[PDB]
Each structure stands twice: as C-alpha cells, then as structure tokens.
Amino acid sequence: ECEVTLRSSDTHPDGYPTVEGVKFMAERAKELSNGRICIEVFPSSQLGEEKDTIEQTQFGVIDMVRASFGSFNDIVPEAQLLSLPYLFRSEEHLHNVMDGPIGDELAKAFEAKDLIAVAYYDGGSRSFYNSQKPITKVEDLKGMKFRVMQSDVFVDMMSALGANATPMPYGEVYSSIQTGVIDGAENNWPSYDSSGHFEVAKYYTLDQHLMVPELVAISKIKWDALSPEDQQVLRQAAEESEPVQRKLWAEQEKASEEKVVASGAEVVREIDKTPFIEAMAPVYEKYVTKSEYQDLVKRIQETQ
C-alpha cells in the first residue's frame, strides 16, 4: 500500500473547501489505484507559506500544491494576467472560462514552469476590509495601507486607487492588522472568516475588485516519474474533486458571511463599482503587453 506517496500543501486549515477538495481527491485516487497512490494533505501552511510552497513544488520537494494564481507573481506570467481586477463578471463566467480552451492554454503555461495543473478550484471574489473606517467610495481608500498578495499587479491596483500596497504572505496579515502596521487587506468571505481577520478588521466593503483563479498543481518532476496508469488516476481524481469543491465553496461563502456578520462585521453593500473599475485603466495598460495577452483578455470578456 501507498507505494506512491504525494505530499500536498495548502495554506488554509482543515475543513476549508480547498482542503476538503484535495482530501476527496486523495480518497478517490487511493480507491481508484487500489491503495497504491496515497496523497497526504498538509494544511495550515505546515510546509511553508504559499509562494514558498509553489517554488518547492517546482523543485519537486513538495509533490502537489493548491494555490491562488495571485501567489505566482512573475513565475507564470499568464497567471498574473488572469489576476487583473474586474476581469471576470461572476463565478459562472470564470467557470466557463477555466472549463474551456482558455483553461487548457493556462495549463500549458503552468507546464512550461514545471507544474501540472490537474484542477481549477473556486475562490469567489475579493473585497476590502480594514480596521480604521467604512469604505463607502473610492476616495475613502486614499493614503491607506492594505496588504495584498505577492504579485506586482496588486501593488499597481492599490496605487491606482490612491492607496499603498504591502505584499506579504497570508499568515502574517492578522498580526500586521492587529498591531496597526497596516490598515487592512482584501479577500473572500471564507478567508476573512477562517483567518481571523474579521476579529481585527470589522469593516468590510463588497467592492469585489478581484476574482483570482486557483489550481491544484502537481510537480512536473514528480509527475514525469509516474506511470501513465497513475497519471490517469490522479487526473481522474482531480477532475472528480472539482464539482465537489465548487459546492463546498458555495456553502462556505454563505456560512462565513453569516458567521462574521453575527460577530459584528460592519458590511457596506451596494457600492457603486464604476469608479473602482475606471481607476484600473493604468493597471490593464501595464500588464496587457502583447497580442498573446490582449487576445486572451478579449476572449475572456467574450466568454458567456
């Protein structure tokens, strides 16, 4: 048994939808391989913060990782491109993009950087939360200090809004907010909840400026050393976990919103997003640098 073992990393805790997703993938891969293939999940950043685990996965030290496109920065340039603000209209839109040929194009981009993309997971939309004041309009962000994920595109996004970005690993955000070093950060409801940030940043504004895709990626080095039979099992188990993870995600979006609101989170709803969207013009100008990227963005916006 467990002749083929794979260590899989996630920054999130046990019980979180992405972790439950890979745990389901692991149960299925074990069943389908008659006990041969054994995926072990290491949650809560046990093996390191997310960007660091991505690099260790590329080197084959970690076998598999569940990660946000936003943690890649320049490592996979099209991953950064798909982290542009207000690129996707909805979770349905994003599903149709990632499920179609654009998803295959991105898979090729990951493979060129020694990562085999076997599933795309849902991460919903990200919105601003802070400890200082309600954000009711773009102008309220002026001069404020917000953590972002470690990609240049998010630093530029904050500058476009007249604020100051500070990239840092997810695990350090809570203390930085708590001690007042930064004013806030931005994320989806389940992160805002499970991270504890709602305890130290009670103001949340549903500006929904990002929908950053996520993936399960296997080390290409480890993958290439597997038999075709074992590769087939992994891909099957990964694809099976996708609809499952999507449903777990939808349920947790609801539960976490309810939870944090029950705890006193002060939420601003119905914000006019138009000025937020307009402000992103320079960001698109800076990152949409080609034909290859221009047409990509175009085909995304054209996807129903």
Give the nearer residue to ligand BDP in terms of CB position, either 50 or 230.
50
CB of 171 to ligand BDP, least distance (A): 9
CB of 291 to ligand BDP, least distance (A): 30
Q: Which of 64, 65, 3, 66 is nearest to 33 (CA)?
A: 3
Given 9, 73, 125, 188, the residue binding ligand BDP (CB under 6 A): 188
68 binds ligand BDP (CB under 6 A): yes
233: alpha, beta or left? (left if phi > 0; alpha if psi -120 to 50): alpha
67 binds ligand BDP (CB under 6 A): yes
Contacts of residue 115, Cβ cutoff 8 Å, sequence gap at least 6: 54, 57, 58, 76, 217, 218, 219, 220
Give the nearer residue to ligand BDP in terms of CB position, either 30 or 86.
86
Given 17, 85, 123, 184, the residue binding ligand BDP (CB under 6 A): 123
CB of 236 to ligand BDP, least distance (A): 24
Given 187, 208, 219, 245, the residue binding ligand BDP (CB under 6 A): 187
Contacts of residue 160, Cβ cutoff 8 Å, sequence gap at least 6: 279, 280, 281, 282, 283
Identify how many contiguous H helices and E strands the chain contains and give both numbers: 14, 11
Given 8, 9, 11, 56, the residue binding ligand BDP (CB under 6 A): 11
CB of 207 to ligand BDP, least distance (A): 15
In this structure, are residues 265 and 198 in contact, taking their beta carbons and an 8 Å threshold?
Answer: yes
191 binds ligand BDP (CB under 6 A): yes
Given 6, 7, 50, 57, the residue binding ligand BDP (CB under 6 A): 50
CA distance 194 to 148: 17
Number of residues that bind ligand BDP (CB under 6 A): 12
- Residues of this chain that interact with ligand BDP (CB under 6 A) are 11, 50, 67-68, 71, 123, 149, 170, 187-188, 191, 214
